Amino acid sequence: TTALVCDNGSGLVKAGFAGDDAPRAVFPSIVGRPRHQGVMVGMGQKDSYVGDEAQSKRGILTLKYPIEHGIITNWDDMEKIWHHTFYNELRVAPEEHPTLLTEAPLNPKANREKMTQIMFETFNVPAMYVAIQAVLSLYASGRTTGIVLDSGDGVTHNVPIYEGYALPHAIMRLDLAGRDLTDYLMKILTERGYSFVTTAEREIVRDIKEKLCYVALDFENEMATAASSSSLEKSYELPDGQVITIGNERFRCPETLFQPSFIGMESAGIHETTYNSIMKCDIDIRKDLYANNVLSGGTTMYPGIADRMQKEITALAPSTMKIKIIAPPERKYSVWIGGSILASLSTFQQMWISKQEYDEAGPSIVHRKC
Amino acid sequence: TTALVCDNGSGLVKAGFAGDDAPRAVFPSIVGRPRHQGVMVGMGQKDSYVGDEAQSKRGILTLKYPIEHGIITNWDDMEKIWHHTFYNELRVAPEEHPTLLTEAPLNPKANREKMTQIMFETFNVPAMYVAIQAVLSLYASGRTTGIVLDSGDGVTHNVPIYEGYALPHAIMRLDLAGRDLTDYLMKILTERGYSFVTTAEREIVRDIKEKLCYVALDFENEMATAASSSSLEKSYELPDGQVITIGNERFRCPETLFQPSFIGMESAGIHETTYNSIMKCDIDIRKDLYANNVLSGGTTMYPGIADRMQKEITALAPSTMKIKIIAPPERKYSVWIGGSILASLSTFQQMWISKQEYDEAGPSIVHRKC
Amino acid sequence: TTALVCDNGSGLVKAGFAGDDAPRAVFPSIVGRPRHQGVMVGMGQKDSYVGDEAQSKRGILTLKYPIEHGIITNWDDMEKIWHHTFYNELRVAPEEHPTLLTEAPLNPKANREKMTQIMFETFNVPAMYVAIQAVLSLYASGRTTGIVLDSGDGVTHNVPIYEGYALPHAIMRLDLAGRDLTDYLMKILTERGYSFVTTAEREIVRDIKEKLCYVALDFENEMATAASSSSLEKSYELPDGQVITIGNERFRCPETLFQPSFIGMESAGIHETTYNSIMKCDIDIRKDLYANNVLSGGTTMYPGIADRMQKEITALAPSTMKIKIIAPPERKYSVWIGGSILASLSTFQQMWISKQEYDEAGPSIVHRKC
Amino acid sequence: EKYSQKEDKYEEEIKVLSDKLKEAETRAEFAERSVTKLEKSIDDLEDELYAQKLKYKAI
Amino acid sequence: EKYSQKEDKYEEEIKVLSDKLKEAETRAEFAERSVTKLEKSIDDLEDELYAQKLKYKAI
Ligand SMILES: Nc1ncnc2c1ncn2[C@@H]1O[C@H](COP(=O)(O)OP(=O)(O)O)[C@@H](O)[C@H]1O
Numbered sequence A, B, C: 001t002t003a004l005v006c007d008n009g010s011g012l013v014k015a016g017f018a019g020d021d022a023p024r025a026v027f028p029s030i031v032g033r034p035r036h037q038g039v040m041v042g043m044g045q046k047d048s049y050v051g052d053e054a055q056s057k058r059g060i061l062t063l064k065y066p067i068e069h070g071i072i073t074n075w076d077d078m079e080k081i082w083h084h085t086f087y088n089e090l091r092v093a094p095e096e097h098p099t100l101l102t103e104a105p106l107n108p109k110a111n112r113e114k115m116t117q118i119m120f121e122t123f124n125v126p127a128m129y130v131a132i133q134a135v136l137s138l139y140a141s142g143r144t145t146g147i148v149l150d151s152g153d154g155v156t157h158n159v160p161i162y163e164g165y166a167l168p169h170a171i172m173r174l175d176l177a178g179r180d181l182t183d184y185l186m187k188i189l190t191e192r193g194y195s196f197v198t199t200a201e202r203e204i205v206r207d208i209k210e211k212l213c214y215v216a217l218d219f220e221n222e223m224a225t226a227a228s229s230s231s232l233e234k235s236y237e238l239p240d241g242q243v244i245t246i247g248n249e250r251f252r253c254p255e256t257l258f259q260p261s262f263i264g265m266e267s268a269g270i271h272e273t274t275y276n277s278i279m280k281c282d283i284d285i286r287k288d289l290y291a292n293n294v295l296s297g298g299t300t301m302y303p304g305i306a307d308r309m310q311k312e313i314t315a316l317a318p319s320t321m322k323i324k325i326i327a328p329p330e331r332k333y334s335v336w337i338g339g340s341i342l343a344s345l346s347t348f349q350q351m352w353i354s355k356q357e358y359d360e361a362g363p364s365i366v367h368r369k370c
Numbered sequence D, E: 001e002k003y004s005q006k007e008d009k010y011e012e013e014i015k016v017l018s019d020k021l022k023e024a025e026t027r028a029e030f031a032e033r034s035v036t037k038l039e040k041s042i043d044d045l046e047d048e049l050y051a052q053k054l055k056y057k058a059i
C-alpha cells in the first residue's frame, strides 16, 4: 500500500504520494476567519476557510498561520489544515496510508509528541514517521555527503552530513526566513510611501518579494549604483491598479540573510553560520563539505544567491579548497522529493511507527526509536 | 542666537523659542477658503485664512488639513502655515534662527527632503534639524529609558529607548489617532438624531470629544450600567442653542483605541501594540521598559486612559513585573518641551544642518547624516 | 613593596594584593560594545564597557570574551581589561607593584611572550612572573604532593606533583570547561521550548547553570527516576518574569564532563583522564597520588561532583588503594589564594623577572628561566 | 500583454546573463593573477634548486 | 512599438552577452589548465629541489 508524504513547513503545505516526482497538492498553510458582519441571509457562511480558498476570499478574512517558527502553535488550526489536506486536496482516507511527516531540527519534543498523537488518534493512520528536512533534501540531491542550507518560511538551518552520518553537534539553527524578510520589506516599503498593514497586504508584499527581489553580488557598490542611475527600478501592479515602483529595496530585502542586523538580530549571516558549522566538524571531512553545499527551500530561490554565497564562503575559507554551491533549479521541493524517495525505499518499511507500538508505548515512542 | 522649535503635528501647530517652558503659539493646523459668493463690494476678501482666524470664520469657509497621517499632502498649504507661524504668530525673521522641526517615525523620505528644501530655499534658515517626536517626549519626561506611546491627531507610535539607545526594529506605528476618533464620533452621533457633515461641524464634534469623552475602565459593565440608569448622560450646547445629550457615546468613542475593529481596522489596541513592542526587545531591558511607559500627545488625554492602560498591560505581562504608566498633566506639549530642551543643549550646536552643508549635498543631506 | 596577583582565567578576572585572604576584585572578563543606534544627544555614549558594567548594560551590548580556551585571542580587549583591573577596580599604579600573572599549561609560547611584553611596555611594572594554575592550587590546598584537577571556564587540566616535583610528561590538558557546558545547556533547553541565542541570553543560561545543575551519582537510574516522577523539576525566573522549569537537564548538563561525547568530542571523561595521568607516573608515587586528588576552579563546584569522581576513580583503580577527593568549600579561588601565598614568600623575591632582565633579553626571557 | 511577458522573460535572461558575466570576468582576472603567482613561485623554486645543484656539483 | 523595440534590444543583448559568456568561459578554462600545469611544475621543482637537498646533506 502506498504512503503519503506531508512536508508541512511554516508557509506551504506540500503533500502527495510516495513514489511520484512532485507534490500533488501545494497550497498556503493558512486559516482565515471572517471579520465583517454578514448580511445576505442564506449565503451559507462558513466558519473558517483553509488553504487557497482562504487566499481568494482574502479581502474579508483575517489570516493566521498555525506554524510560527517551525513550531505548531495552534493545534486546532493545524488539525483543520491536515483534515483539508487529506480529504479535499488528496482525496484519500488517512486510515489506509502510512504518513511521512517532516520537522525541522532542534525544536521542542512536545511538537513531535503532539504530532504523532494527533495522527494516531484523530486520523487513525496505520503508521507514521517524522523525518528531518535536511536529510530528505540530501536524498533528493542525490548525495550522501554535504552540508545543506534549508531556508523555508520560518527557520533556516544547516545540517552537515558525511557518508550518511550526521554531526548533531554541528547543526546550527537560525530563526530568520521568508517571513522575516516579508516583514522587513513591509517596513522598508513605507519609506517610499506605500503602506501595507493588513494580513492580506502581507500576502501582497510576499508576492512582491517573490517577483522583484534579488541578492546583490556586492552590496555596497550595488547601493551606490542604484543611487546613481535609475535602471534598477521595476514596477509592480497591486490588484486594484495602483502601480508601485521599488528601487534599492529589491536587494535590500534579501540582504538581511547576510546581515541579520538589519532586523535587529545579533546572529551572523547564512554564509558565516555555514562556515562555522563546517569548522565545527572534524578536520578530515570539511574539505568534502566545502564542495557539497546543498541549497534548499523557498528562501534560497532569489536570483544571485548562489553567487553571493560562493563569494562569501570563498572569502572565508582557505584559499586552496574548492567551494561549490549546489543550487538545483527545483530546490523549492527538495524536501518533499527526498521524502518520497525515502518512503519508497524497500529497506525503510521497517522504520514506520506501527499503531501497535504507539498503543504500547504512548506518544513518547516517536523520539525514542524513530 | 536663539533657535525656533516648530512641532508641526497633524492637528495643531506648536511653535516657540528654544529655552522657554511652553510653546508661544498654539493654533490649529488648518487652511480655510471661502465657498460662498461674496457680495459686499469693498469688504476686502482674502483668498485664504490660516490658523485660528480660519476657525472663527469657519461658518463660510471649507477647512482643510495639509497633513493627513503625519505626512504633508499639500505643500502649498503647509508653506502658508509655516509663513503664518513665522511672521504673524512668532513675529520673527526666519533668516536669523535655526529651526528644529519634528516628524513621526516610519514615514516617507520625501517628507523630510521637502521639509528641508522648503526651509533652506523659501525661508533661508541658517540651519535646521528634524527630530523624532518620541525622543523629544522622553527628553521632556526627564528619563533616558522607557517605551513612549505618542498619540496625536494623525498617528500613534511606540518607540522603546534604553540608556539612550533606540530599538528601531521594535518601533511600531499605528494609523488611528484623534481624527479617526472624531470621525467615529460623528458617525455614532447619528444614531441619536444629530447630523454633522460639514467640516465646521467636524470641529464642533472635535470639541464635544475633548469635553465629554472618557475611557471606561471595564467596557462591558460600563455599557450595561449606561443601559440601566441614565447617570452617565451629559449635555452639550452647540453654538446656536440646541442642547444635545449623549450617553454611552462618551466612552464608546475613545474605546476605539483599545478595539480598533470598531472603525473596521485589523490592528490591535494600543495596549497590545505596546506589549508587542516591549516583547520585541531584548529580554534584559524589558523589565525596565515595563515600568517606564511614557504617554504623550493629545489623544492620551482622556480621563481614565492611564488606568485602563495599566489594567490591560498588567493582564498581559507576567504577574511579577511592576507596570507603571507615566502620564504627566502637561503631556500634551511634551514633544515641544523636549524639543526646546534639546535645542538648548550646548552639545547639540554641532548637530545642526548648516546652510553650507545643504548647498554642498542637496536635500538628501537630511537623513543621510542627521 | 607589595605585589599584585592577577589570576586571569577565561571567565572571571580575580585580582588582589599579595598577602590577602581573598581576591579584592572579581568581575567578568567581558568587553561589551553597543549594537543599536543611540538617539539621546548628550547622553555621553562610551565606546565600550568592561567588567560588570558591561554586565548591567547587557541588553544593548554585544559581549565578547577576549580569552577563548585559555588563549588570549583579542589583545586590545585584554589590554582594556587589564587597564580596568589596575585603575578602576584596584585603584593602584602598575609602576609600583610586581605582578604575578597566571596561565594554563600547554598553551602557545606567544601567549606568555605577548603577556610579558604588554606588562613591561604599556604598564611599566617593576617585575612580573607567570605561574601555573595547578601549582598555585596546590599551594592553597596546603600540600606538596597530589594530582590537581583544575577546571575553569575554558580549559580542564591535570597536573601531578610529588614532593614539589612536577611530572610534565603526565600533564593532560582537556578543552571542555564551563563555557562548553553553558553552550550544551543552551542547546538542551530548546527541546523544552526555551530559546536563548544572544550573548546576553548566554549569560542568563550561565546563571541557570550555576543555580540549578548538579552531577548525578548514577546517570542511568537518575534519568529513569526523572522520567518516572516529577520531583527533580525546579523553576527559575528570567529577568522579565517568564518562569521556566527544567527537569533532567539539571544533571544532563554537567554529565558532559564525564561523557564528553554528548558535545561530539572524542576525549574521555575527567575521571578517566585523571586515572590516565596517574597511571602515566612512576609506580611508586601513584599510591600517594590516589589519595590527594585536589579539585579546583569553578566548574568543579557542582553539587555531587566529588562523590561521582570518587566512585568513578574507585571503580577504575585497584581495589585496595584509598581514593580521596579533596574538594575545599572555597575551591573556586584556590588559584588566586595560592598565588597570593607564593608572591608573599620571602624566598620567592628572587624569581621575579626584573625590568632590566627584560630590557636585556627581549620578551623571550619569560620561558628561559621563569 | 503577450509582448509584455516576452519582454519580461527577456529582461530576466538579460539580468541573469549579465550577473554571470560579471562573476566570470572577476573569475578570469583572479585566474590571471593566479598565473602570475605561479610564474613567480616556479621562478623562486628554479633559483633555489639551481643553487643547491651548484653546491652539490661543487662538492 | 515600444515593446517591439525593447524586445529587439533585449534580443541583441542576449546574443552579445551569450557570445561573451562563451568566450569568457573558454579563455577561463584554458587559463585554468595553464594554472594546472604550472602547479604540477611547482610540484616537480619542489621535488627535485628536495632531491638536491638530499644529495647535499649526504655529501
Ligand atoms: N521565487 C522566490 N523568490 C524569493 N522568495 C521566495 C520565492 N518563492 C518562495 N519564496 C519565499 O519562500 C517562502 C516559502 O518557502 P517554502 O520552502 O515553501 O517554506 P516552507 O518549507 O516553510 O513551507 C515564502 O515565504 C516566500 O517568501
Ligand SMILES: Nc1ncnc2c1ncn2[C@@H]1O[C@H](COP(=O)(O)OP(=O)(O)O)[C@@H](O)[C@H]1O
Binding pocket: B008, B009, B010, B011, B012, B013, B151, B152, B153, B154, B178, B179, B182, B206, B209, B210, B211, B297, B298, B299, B301, B302, B332
Ligand atoms: N482634553 C482632550 N481630551 C481628549 N482628546 C483630546 C484632548 N485634547 C486634544 N485631544 C485630541 O488630540 C488631538 C490633538 O492632539 P495633538 O497632540 O496636538 O496632535 P498633533 O501632535 O498631531 O498636533 C485632537 O485631534 C483632539 O481630538
Ligand SMILES: Nc1ncnc2c1ncn2[C@@H]1O[C@H](COP(=O)(O)OP(=O)(O)O)[C@@H](O)[C@H]1O
Binding pocket: C008, C009, C010, C011, C012, C013, C151, C152, C153, C154, C178, C179, C182, C206, C209, C210, C211, C297, C298, C299, C300, C301, C302, C332
Ligand atoms: N556554583 C557553580 N556551580 C556550577 N558551575 C559554576 C558555579 N560557579 C561557577 N561555575 C562555572 O565556572 C565558570 C567560572 O569558573 P572560574 O574558575 O572563574 O573559571 P576561570 O578561572 O577560567 O575564570 C563559569 O563559566 C561557570 O559556568
